[PDB]
């Protein structure tokens, strides 16, 4: 809608207070005009029809518990936009400042979030497995990164290309979490997963096997569930990314870490320059080596570390 840009205040899913960019025109709308062509947050009203209605609020204060998932979806989309712009010189997910849209309160007891090809969508969770999924910045950034992947490499959501697609979302999900400095870690979904149980998460990048995912190519899933294991075999790539950044010794192979910033640079380049819709793990290795070579030279420590990490997880 057309109106006056302003700033409102609200409380997120975890009870934290934050300022959000809104737009005033009779009502205050969750429409952020300060970033690209805008960030728009919608109320799906417990239904499955999308996007629902542009979130309207009478007083520019968002402290109702019904408001919380909208606050976080709106706010964390903004942070994710800032990350891609400031760190990678990318304007929104298409590189041309496309409007970013999210719907919250999708369906009832819905334990999931997704990019549907056009927008992000967040369930409220069932209150047991999940609380509202937009409450996690690594969740929001994971989703938005699916959009980035779709407009760049276009990795098919199936088998090894799908696992790479998933890992890219987990990796940048995590990098965005570190960027915002919000209790950052190498775990996925910890803020919104199992509110009854402390210290756990949905997946782990530092140790994927902790939650049943492979941390070595020899342990990959070869069946047909989960589109050929796209949320399972991603563990292999996630572990490699963890090693490149943090370093460590894994199945007897030692890796010197080069840190988060370079990890991000190398994988962003691979994603945008070298990966294709049907890239497999071995092609990912080649893309990452080539990207590090482009950026730091073929005899750099960076190239060496990328090679050791993929050796460590058994990807040749
Ligand atoms: O597979 C899909 O299309 C949707 C799937 N969604 C999903 O797993 O929702 C929960 C969640 C997402 C990110 C981080 C932690 C938890 C995905 O985006 O991979
Ligand atoms: Ca209000
Ligand atoms: Ca965290
Ligand atoms: Ca996390
Ligand atoms: Ca938990
Ligand atoms: Zn995903």
Curated annotation (Swiss-Prot):
GO CC list: extracellular region
Cofactor binding annotation: Binds 4 Ca(2+) ions per subunit. Binds 1 zinc ion per subunit.
Keyword Transferase: no
Residues bound to Ca(2+) 4: 194, 197, 200
Keywords assigned by UniProt, alphabetized: Calcium, Hydrolase, Metal-binding, Metalloprotease, Protease, Secreted, Signal, Zinc, Zymogen
Chain positions recorded as Ca(2+) 3 binding sites: 177, 183, 185, 190
Catalytic residues identified in the record: 143, 231 (proton donor)
Main location: secreted
Catalytic activity: Preferential cleavage: Xaa-|-Leu > Xaa-|-Phe
Coiled-coil residue spans: none
Locations listed in the record: Secreted
Induction: Is expressed in the stationary phase. Up-regulated by NprA.
UniProt superkingdom: Bacteria
Binding-site positions, Zn(2+): 142, 146, 166
GO molecular function per UniProt: metal ion binding; metalloendopeptidase activity
Cofactor(s) in the UniProt record: Ca(2+); Zn(2+)
EC number: 3.4.24.27
Residues engaged in binding Ca(2+) 1: 57, 59, 61
Temperature behavior of the protein's activity: Thermostable. Retains about 45% of its activity after treatment of 90 degrees Celsius for 30 minutes.
GO biological process: proteolysis
Residues where Ca(2+) 2 binds: 138, 177, 185, 187, 190
Function: Extracellular zinc metalloprotease.
Family stated for the protein in its record: Belongs to the peptidase M4 family.
Protein name: Thermolysin
Protein's organism: Geobacillus stearothermophilus (Bacillus stearothermophilus)
Full protein: residues contained: 236 to 551 of 551
């Amino acid at each position: 809608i057309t109106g006056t840009s302003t700033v409102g205040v609200g409380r997120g899913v975890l009870g934290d207070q934050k300022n959000i960019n809104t737009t005033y025109s009779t009502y205050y709308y969750l429409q952020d005009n300060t970033r690209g062509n805008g960030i728009f947050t919608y109320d799906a009203k417990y239904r499955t029809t999308l996007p629902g209605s542009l979130w309207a609020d009478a007083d520019n204060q968002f402290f109702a518990s019904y408001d919380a998932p909208a606050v976080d979806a709106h706010y964390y989309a903004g942070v994710t936009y800032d990350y891609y712009k400031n760190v990678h010189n990318r304007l929104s997910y298409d590189g041309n400042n496309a409007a970013i849209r999210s719907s919250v309160h999708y369906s009832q007891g819905y334990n999931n979030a997704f990019w549907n090809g056009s927008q992000m969508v967040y369930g409220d969770g069932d209150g047991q497995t999940f609380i509202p999924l937009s409450g996690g910045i690594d969740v929001v950034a994971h989703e938005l990164t699916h959009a980035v992947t779709d407009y760049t490499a276009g990795l098919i959501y199936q088998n090894e290309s799908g696992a790479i697609n998933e890992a890219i979302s987990d990796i940048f999900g995590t990098l965005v979490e570190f960027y915002a400095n919000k209790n950052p870690d190498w775990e996925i979904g910890e803020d919104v997963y199992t509110p009854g149980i402390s210290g756990d998460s949905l997946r782990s990048m530092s140790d994927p096997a902790k939650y049943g995912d492979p941390d070595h190519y020899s342990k990959r899933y070869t069946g047909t569930q989960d589109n050929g294991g796209v949320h399972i075999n991603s563990g292999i790539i996630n572990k490699a990314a963890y090693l490149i950044s943090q370093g460590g010794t894994h199945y007897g192979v030692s890796v010197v870490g080069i840190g988060r910033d370079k990890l991000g640079k190398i994988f962003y380049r691979a994603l945008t320059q070298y990966l294709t819709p049907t890239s497999n793990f071995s092609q990912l290795r080649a893309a990452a080596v080539q990207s590090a070579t482009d950026l730091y030279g073929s005899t750099s420590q960076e190239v060496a570390s990328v090679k050791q990490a993929f050796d460590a997880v058994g990807v040749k």
